[PDB]
């Protein structure tokens, strides 16, 4: 049933898709902190299924108690914030499931949180999944890719530090 066991095809800073679907303008997030990049900048992603993963080899910072989001520090001094959907914290951890732990180092691709794309599909307010860089101050240039992406595979952003 799961190829999780089998071997995969294996191919300045590049940030990788930490979850999958269609990329989106931060600007369209139904939440201001996001949409005005108050929290920082990056993109978003309408999601396709199953799981959230490290997008940089770094170290997972904090993991939300209701496990719907997490942050992480790249070995390259970048800060990432991944927030699944919006107002998700009201589902109180239902659909979510904690693969990793609030302290480890990870490579790109390592499973971080698993999820239930459909329970979440009608329960949640929105499903948008912002991916932003929070420490926008220590970053020169930041670029936004487009279209479709695939987990731990397609990159969404490129940035010059």
């Amino acid at each position: 049933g799961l190829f999780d066991k089998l071997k995969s095809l294996v191919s300045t800073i590049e940030i990788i898709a930490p979850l999958s679907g269609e990329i989106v303008n931060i600007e369209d997030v139904p939440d201001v902190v996001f949409a005005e990049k108050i929290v920082g900048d990056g993109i978003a992603i309408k999601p396709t299924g199953n799981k959230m993963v490290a997008p940089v080899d770094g170290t997972i910072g904090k993991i939300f108690e209701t496990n719907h989001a997490f942050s992480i520090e790249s070995d390259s001094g970048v800060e990432l914030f991944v927030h699944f959907g919006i107002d998700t914290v009201e589902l109180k951890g239902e659909g979510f499931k904690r693969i990793a732990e609030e302290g480890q180092r990870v490579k790109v691709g390592d499973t971080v949180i698993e999820f239930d794309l459909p329970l979440l599909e009608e329960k949640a307010k929105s499903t948008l999944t912002p991916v932003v860089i929070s420490n926008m101050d220590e970053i020169k240039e930041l670029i936004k890719l487009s279209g479709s992406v695939t987990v731990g595979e397609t990159p969404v952003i490129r940035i010059k530090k």
Binding site: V33, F34, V39, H83, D87, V89, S134
Partner: protein
């Protein structure tokens, strides 16, 4: 050469001495008793403010080594609303001071509403029917003393607010003046007409005889012997000023005994449609300006509560440390309506409540919850402020004593999803009076002489938890709605 400001606050009395270059030179604080003679009631003792305020002066002057010879003027700042009556001859109170919080004259307000004055009072006072302001505290006094009204028509009876009382006790009985800021607070004065309301006065059965003289917030009121007193402004307003409020759409939030959020509305009396107060502030020369205000009764007080009655902390400073030992309030909410709800609730009936407790909740959840209440309230007031004025703040300038709380500061920021600018000198309410004093005395000439002592010391910006804010606030919202209407009538 230097000005000297006087800050007589809910909690305590202070005395600041600044130089021309506007540097805080020496300070004196002295806290004073709080009496609750009955539940929803608060009262302070006129002679104690008095003793405490006086005493504070000397000690500052002394501390720095300075005399009558080197002080340009006296600037005066006080706590609002808090009503006082006193036999003219004597220099003695016919009662205790009723504090701004004290919910006593609550039924009275209930008549006022019963009659139909909500509308009126709104429109001319810019105030709102509530025990919060001077008016009713006056009548309640006159009403609970045999020889009062009459004794006062004959006029042996004096009314006043802290500035007025503070002044007269210095101009040895000579001067009876309140400022423009002070007066708006009273519920007796007319903000457009800029003079005592005949209606209020009547309706309330107050006698023009006791009312003092109402004058500019920068003027030489008189001389006193430590010398002239050139400044007067209600505390919240003197801080608006020290922040250099002064221009349209400009705003600050003061975190002290209570929380006061104000925005300068230049020369336009914006009519609040969102639980807010239309009141007076100053424009750059100490002239009359209008403004929107959000009052929140309990802020720093709560900390004092944990500190002094509950006994969970030795210092309010410690709250940061414990509140941070916890990550979450663990479900708990603290609605600190210890003395009703103010803006924009205005429910003199609600009382303090605690919620969401379970066996695993401990002291630290609780403290932090108290700290949180602060930002919640703040935020309540703010949203109002915005709707009303159609403007969207991008930063919050702040100041106050509680503002030294990195935690609270930050949390305040996250919960708003807005930056928070914390000024390098926290003691702004003081500064304000000074300027009003100095300016009025040629001590300074121009505000511009000073768009420099106003360094920002710190910026708090929204952390990642800012995403969580809506949920957390809804918490708050439900909690609040449950503390309401607790008392009865």
């Amino acid at each position: 050469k230097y000005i000297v400001a006087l800050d007589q606050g809910t909690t305590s009395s202070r005395a600041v001495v600044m130089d021309h270059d506007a540097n805080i030179i020496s300070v004196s604080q002295r806290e004073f008793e709080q009496i609750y003679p009955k539940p929803g009631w608060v009262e302070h003792d006129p002679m104690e403010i008095w003793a405490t305020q006086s005493s504070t002066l000397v000690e500052v002057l002394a501390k720095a080594d300075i005399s009558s010879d080197q002080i340009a003027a006296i600037g005066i700042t006080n706590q609002r609303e808090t009503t006082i009556v006193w036999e003219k001859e004597t220099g003695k109170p016919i009662y205790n001071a009723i504090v701004w919080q004290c919910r006593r004259t609550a039924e009275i307000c209930e008549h006022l509403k019963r009659d139909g004055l909500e509308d009126y009072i709104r429109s001319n006072t810019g105030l709102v029917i509530d025990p919060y302001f001077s008016g009713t505290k006056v009548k309640w006094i006159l009403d609970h003393v045999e020889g009062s009204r009459e004794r006062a028509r004959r006029g042996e009876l004096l009314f006043g607010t802290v500035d007025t009382w503070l002044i007269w006790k210095m101009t040895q009985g000579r001067v009876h003046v309140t400022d423009y800021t002070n007066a708006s607070r009273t519920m007796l004065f007319n903000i457009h007409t800029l003079d005592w309301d005949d209606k209020m006065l009547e309706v309330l059965d107050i006698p023009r005889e006791m009312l003092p003289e109402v004058r500019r917030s920068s003027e030489v009121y008189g001389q006193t012997n430590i010398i002239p007193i050139s400044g007067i402004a209600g505390d919240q307003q003197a801080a608006l000023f020290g922040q250099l409020c002064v221009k349209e759409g400009m705003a600050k939030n003061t975190y002290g005994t209570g929380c006061f959020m104000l925005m300068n509305t230049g020369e336009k009396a914006v009519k609040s449609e969102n639980g807010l107060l239309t009141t007076i502030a100053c424009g750059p020369t100490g002239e009359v300006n209008y403004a929107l205000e959000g009052a929140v009764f309990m802020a720093g007080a709560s900390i004092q509560w944990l500190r002094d009655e509950m006994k969970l902390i030795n210092d309010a400073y410690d709250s940061e440390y414990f509140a941070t030992k916890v990550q979450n309030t663990n479900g708990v909410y603290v609605v600190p309506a210890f003395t009703g709800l103010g803006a924009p609730y205005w429910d003199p009936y609600a009382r303090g409540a605690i919620f969401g407790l379970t066996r695993g909740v401990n002291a630290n959840h609780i403290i932090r919850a108290t700290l949180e209440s602060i930002a919640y309230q703040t935020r309540d007031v703010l949203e109002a402020m915005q709707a009303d004025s159609g403007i969207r703040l991008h930063a919050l300038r702040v100041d106050g004593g509680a503002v030294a709380n990195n935690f609270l500061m930050q949390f305040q920021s996250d919960i708003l999803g807005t930056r928070v600018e914390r000024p390098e000198v926290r003691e702004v309410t003081a500064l304000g009076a000074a300027y009003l004093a100095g300016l009025a005395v040629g001590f300074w000439q121009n505000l511009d002489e000073l768009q420099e002592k106003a360094v920002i010391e710190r910026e708090f910006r929204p952390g990642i938890e800012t995403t969580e804010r809506n949920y957390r606030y809804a918490g708050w919202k439900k909690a609040v709605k449950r503390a309401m209407a607790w008392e009865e009538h």
